[PDB]
Structures are given as structure tokens and as C-alpha cells.
Design a protein around this ligand. Structure first.
Ligand SMILES: [Ca+2]
Lengths: 14, 223
């Protein structure tokens, strides 16, 4: 559930 | 920025856009040759766009300068996102004026409840995609580390803080990463991460700039 706020984002399953 | 307002042209003169054939992150100008961004925004060949308001149209006050060096924190952790800070040195010094200006680094860390200004060209929709032409701004309070760790159990380090609104609707979002959190005219934070954007009980997480002032100064001295 953690996601960076870049384009594109990196968002993890947590 | 979700739930924010149009800043007004060049009203945030330290805000920069990082461009790679599209806008992909923000940053903050801290002297004529250096910009602070997030380490997760690292890539080769960054072009720094200063003086921007409408990012899709050249209006006249912009300065485009290529990054000569893009220096992530040497202990940045790409999973935990600890130490999510990067320094970008510019190939040539920016011409400082009213619309292109540096922001002071902090002399102390800010306290919870302090009101800050968060800005960027990121998405304005919390579920979907709408990217603005012009710069957007959000006023938001620093939350207590207690509330931050309650929202994000096991995930908040000493180098992170939360800011925003636990009711949802107002937050930084995709495309805002690396941009500024300014409180009382000092750069206290860098847009970093969150669980989605503007979701209930999931405020934005920000890199705590006050912990890096020594590393910033040494890095400027050594490059
Ligand atoms: Ca422009």
C-alpha cells in the first residue's frame, strides 16, 4: 500500500 | 495536488519541474546551482525547468537547465523509502530574479500543527488522472508523529513526517514527488509517498529536510 508520487509511481503490495 | 488551488504564476519561485520529455517530478531551488528533490525521482539526463507556471506552454520566464549531477542520498533505501532526498546540481547557474528564487533551508525542525505550503503539477484527482497545466498549491498542517505512525504502522522512520488531512480530499499526488513543503519560509519537506492520495486516514508522507542540512552543505561543498 505504499506508493511514491512520481510519474510513473512505484507502488508496493503493502 | 488534490483539493488545492491555483497558486498564481511564479508565486512559488523556488518550485521547479523535472522533465524527461514530460513532467515527472518536482523539486526546490536552494541556491543558483542546486535543487532538492526526492531520491526516487532519480534518472539520468534530467532537465530542470525553473520559472514555470503553465508547464505545457513556453510563456517567457522559464529557464531550462540540464542537470550535470543528480546525487541521491548514499543511504537511500528504495523499499522503505528512508532517506528519500536527492541533490541536483545544474550545468550552469540559474539567473535569480523575482520568478526564480531559492528557498531557505531550515535552522530547526518544524513542530506538529505548523501550517505549510505544498505545491506541484501532479494529478488533481484521487481516483483517476487529471494533470493540470498550471501550478497547484495546498495549505496543510504537519501531523504528529503519533498520528503518522497510527496511519502507517511500521513504515515511518525518523526521517519522515506526515502532513495533510485525515478526513481525505486534500493531499499531494502522482507528479508532485520531489517538490516542496515550505513552513514559515523554510524548506521542511519533500513530497515522497503515501497510500494512494487524499484517502481517509492516509495522509501524505514527506522527507524531513531538517535532518539533512549537514549532508546538503557537505554535498554542495564537495561538488
Ligand atoms: Ca511554461
Amino acid at each position: 500500500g505504499r506508493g511514491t508520487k512520481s510519474i510513473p509511481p512505484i507502488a508496493f503490495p503493502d | 495536488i488534490v483539493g488545492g488551488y491555483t497558486c498564481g504564476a511564479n508565486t512559488v519561485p523556488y518550485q521547479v519541474s523535472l522533465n524527461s520529455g514530460y513532467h515527472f517530478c518536482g523539486g526546490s531551488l536552494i541556491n543558483s546551482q542546486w535543487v532538492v528533490s526526492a531520491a526516487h525521482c532519480y534518472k539520468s539526463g534530467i532537465q530542470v525547468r525553473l520559472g514555470e507556471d503553465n508547464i505545457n506552454v513556453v510563456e517567457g520566464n522559464e529557464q531550462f537547465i540540464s542537470a550535470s549531477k543528480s546525487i541521491v542520498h548514499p543511504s537511500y533505501n528504495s523499499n522503505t523509502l528512508n532517506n528519500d532526498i536527492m541533490l541536483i546540481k545544474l550545468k550552469s547557474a540559474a539567473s535569480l530574479n523575482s520568478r526564480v528564487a531559492s528557498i531557505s533551508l531550515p535552522t530547526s525542525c518544524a513542530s506538529a500543527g505548523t501550517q505549510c505550503l505544498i505545491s506541484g503539477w501532479g494529478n488533481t484527482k484521487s481516483s483517476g488522472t487529471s494533470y493540470p497545466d498550471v501550478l497547484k498549491c495546498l495549505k496543510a498542517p504537519i501531523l504528529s508523529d503519533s498520528s503518522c505512525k497510527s496511519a502507517y504502522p511500521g513504515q515511518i522512520t525518523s526521517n519522515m513526517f506526515c502532513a495533510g488531512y485525515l478526513e481525505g480530499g486534500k493531499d499531494s499526488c502522482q507528479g508532485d514527488s520531489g517538490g516542496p513543503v515550505v513552513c514559515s519560509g523554510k524548506l521542511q519537506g519533500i513530497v515522497s509517498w503515501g497510500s494512494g492520495c487524499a484517502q481517509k486516514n492516509k495522509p501524505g508522507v514527506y522527507t524531513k529536510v531538517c535532518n539533512y542540512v549537514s549532508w546538503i552543505k557537505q554535498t554542495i561543498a564537495s561538488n
